[PDB]
Amino acid sequence: QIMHRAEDLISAASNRYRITVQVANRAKRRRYEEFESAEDAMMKPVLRAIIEMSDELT
């Protein structure tokens, strides 16, 4: 689940920083790109970013 994904995400990746930031900017793009595509009000671009980086990417 996203929670365990969020865990697995950084349970087997680069510096926990290093990750984040790239999670971050990603979502940044996930927000910039697809700007207000699917409302996303619920699945924050960050959340997206995470899942698509903690499961999709994995």
């Binding site: 969020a6 984040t20 930031v21 999670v23 409302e39 009000a41 960050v46």
Partner: protein, 620 residues
């Protein structure tokens, strides 16, 4: 960030000081200087035109408005006023201009002077009460010329002696030596400025090898300064100074107060003082008053200056209408409250909210209560955004208004804005990193913050009235790492020690205790038998057994019992797999039967709960 790399601490030579306020204009004639100590006019309130708030040298307080007038709009910007020479440039140009005072007398920087090493002295090789005398007009010095005769160099003529130096007058033999009797810093000046120093750190270093068991400390010191100076471009003379910078006015702001009264700033005060003293003194030499006034005078000036720099340093702490020591330049950037330490490492941000605190049962961990009142404001904008997204709100003021109307959205949209959006909580200033973590803001009614027990220890909270404080993160990136790495879930254990820190702590322990204890006499459902399914449970709601009641339970897994028993006891040697064997807890079937076909555990029906409860929470 990419504007500069390193800073360059140092001193401000009189050119650089006067280079803090030139504001030369296209009429071509320089300014930045202030010829008046007074502040805004009495009739109107405008800033004189050469006082502590002269616009034309700091800037038009009224955005694009030549103090003269004629222009009251950005339209007139680069263009200035002929008549006033006001530099029309909005108003933020102030708070940064600086201006300065040509000094009618030099002043040995308090800092270099009464300093721990009194560098001045360190370089003058002359202790205080001697060089300290020289300022303060209190003695004299021979001067290099003054002592070219019987006089001995750096001999303090004080005054009586100095007069005796005037005695034995040149009307007699000899007395052809020179002058510069050091009554004032004006001479300490050319002391400094006298000396060369390339010889120091080498010709002086001649010593340093020698005098093996000599003072040593003295010298090397005296070096390292010197050396330093020469190493930098520092000529000691720069230390005394001659012209004074001046704070962009508004930082010494001064302000109309509603009731009409005004908010004077000690800055302009110290200042203005030294102005007078100065001017006046110039008028004293202008009127060629007999010294001892003018002398006195300088002395004063001197320390007016001084106090400005640093009140209370040396002479008598100035005490104005504030009915207390004033607040010199130094001290506003010093102490516990020097600029540094409190506005600067500790500023005082918004997007926050405090409150009392209260246990938030029902609400799980990694969540927080949140009152509705505060949650709005914290989230203010974000929400309005969502308005406009949903379109319900058109402009903002639209929103604004609607926000106060608490339309359905206000308590509907919001919380969609909100979840996901971590928040950070903190119980008072907290060194510990875990002292503050990330949290999911869930709305809640009254006004407290709900709060989870498991996290309580970390923050160390009572609930006797503590309070906490909230902040909220913005960039999205900054959200990320809330989640990612402060989210109060994921931090279980003390960073100071692998130990966990979440730990069910009180009563909840004793729940568990009491759950799992071992009431003696346990009879109801004691010595009973069970086989998975959580059977025994059912029995429990049907009280088939007692919460506290030893009973066999089919469980093929492992115990741990405490009080290990591993070895058998009283194996039941009968038939197939019937060694079948006891244990202080177990009871089991190996041999022919198999390996462990039987597996009844001697455990109370609580403990089974517990075990269960974990269990399922854990894997599945």
């Amino acid at each position: 960030t990419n504007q500069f790399d390193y800073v360059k601490i140092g001193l401000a030579s009189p050119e650089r000081i006067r280079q803090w306020g030139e504001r030369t204009l296209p009429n071509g004639q320089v300014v930045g200087e202030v010829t008046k100590p007074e502040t805004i006019n009495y009739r109107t309130l405008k800033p004189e035109m050469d006082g502590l708030f002269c616009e034309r040298i700091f800037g038009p307080a009224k955005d694009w408005e030549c103090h003269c007038g004629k222009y009251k709009r950005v339209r007139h910007r680069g263009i200035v006023c002929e008549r006033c020479g006001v530099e029309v440039t909005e108003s933020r140009v102030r708070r940064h201009r600086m201006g300065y005072i040509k000094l009618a007398a030099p002043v040995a920087h308090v800092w270099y002077l009464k300093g721990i090493p009194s560098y001045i002295s360190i370089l003058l090789d002359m202790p205080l009460r001697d060089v300290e005398q020289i300022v303060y007009f209190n003695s004299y010095v021979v001067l290099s010329p003054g002592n070219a005769e019987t006089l001995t160099y750096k001999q303090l003529l004080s005054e009586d002696q100095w007069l005796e130096i005037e005695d034995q007058i040149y009307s007699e033999d000899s007395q052809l030596q020179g002058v510069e009797v050091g009554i004032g810093a004006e001479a300490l000046l050319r002391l400094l400025a006298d000396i060369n120093l390339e010889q120091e750190a080498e010709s002086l270093r001649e010593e340093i090898g020698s005098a093996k068991g000599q003072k040593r400390a003295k010298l090397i010191k005296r070096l390292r300064v010197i050396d330093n100076f020469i190493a930098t471009g520092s000529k000691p003379e720069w230390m005394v100074m001659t012209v004074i910078p001046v704070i962009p006015p508004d930082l010494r702001p001064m302000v109309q107060l509603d009731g009409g009264r005004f908010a004077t700033s000690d800055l302009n005060d110290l200042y203005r003082r030294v102005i007078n003293r100065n001017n006046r003194l110039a008028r004293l030499q202008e009127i060629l008053a007999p010294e001892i006034i003018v002398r006195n005078e300088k002395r004063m000036l001197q320390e007016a200056v001084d106090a400005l720099i640093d009140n209370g340093r040396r002479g008598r702490t100035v005490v104005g209408a504030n009915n207390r020591p004033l607040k010199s330049l130094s001290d506003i950037i010093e102490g516990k409250q020097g600029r540094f330490r409190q506005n600067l490492l500790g500023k005082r941000v918004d997007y926050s909210g405090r409150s009392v605190i209260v246990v938030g049962p029902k609400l799980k961990i990694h969540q927080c209560g949140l009152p509705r009142e505060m949650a709005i404001e914290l989230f203010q904008p974000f929400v309005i955004n969502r308005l406009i997204r949903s379109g319900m709100v058109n402009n903002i003021k639209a929103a604004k208004k609607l926000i106060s109307r608490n339309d359905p959205s206000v308590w509907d949209v919001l919380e969609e804005v909100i979840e996901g959006h971590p928040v950070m909580l903190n119980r008072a200033p907290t060194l510990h990193r875990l002292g503050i973590q990330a949290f999911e803001p869930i709305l809640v009614e009254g006004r407290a913050i709900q709060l989870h027990p498991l996290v309580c220890p970390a923050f160390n909270a009572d609930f006797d009235g503590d309070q906490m404080a909230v902040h909220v993160p913005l960039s999205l990136e900054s959200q990320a790492e809330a989640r990612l790495l402060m989210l109060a879930s994921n931090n279980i254990l003390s960073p100071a020690t692998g130990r966990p820190i979440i730990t069910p702590s009180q009563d909840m322990v004793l729940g568990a205790y009491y759950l799992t204890a071992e009431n003696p006499g346990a009879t109801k459902g004691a010595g009973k038998y069970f086989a998975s399914l959580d059977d025994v449970i059912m029995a429990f709601q049907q009280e088939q057994i007692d919460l506290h009641a030893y009973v066999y339970v089919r469980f093929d897994g492992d115990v741990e019992s405490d009080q290990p028993d591993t070895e058998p006891v009283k194996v039941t040697t009968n038939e197939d797999g019937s060694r079948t064997v006891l244990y202080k807890y177990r009871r089991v079937r190996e041999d022919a039967q198999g390996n462990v076909i039987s597996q009844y555990i001697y455990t109370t029906p609580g403990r089974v709960i517990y075990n269960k409860a974990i269990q399922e929470a854990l894997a599945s």
